Structure formats: structure tokens, C-alpha cells
Amino acid sequence: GPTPMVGLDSVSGQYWDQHAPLAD
């Protein structure tokens, strides 16, 4: 994902994602 944190992406890219894993 699009963060600056180098590591795994739930979508794609060389850095982490910043998606929204909510709960209710």
C-alpha cells in the first residue's frame, strides 16, 4: 500500500496499506 512504512501491502506496493478494518 501507499504508506511510507516498508513492508507488506494488502493490495500492492513496497510499503504498508492504510485501509479500514472496522468492527461493530
| Residue 6 φ/ψ, nearest 5 degrees | -70, 120
Q: Are the CB atoms for 14 and 2 separated by under 8 Å?
A: no
Closest CA to 19 of 10, 8, 7: 10
Cα gap 17→8, rounded to integer Å: 8
9 to 12, 18, 19, 24: CA distances (angstroms): 5, 9, 10, 24
Greatest C-alpha distance within the chain? 31
Cell of residue 19, nine digits:
485501509
| Residue 8 φ/ψ, nearest 5 degrees | -65, 145
Experimental technique, in short, is: NMR
Cα gap 3→19, rounded to integer Å: 10
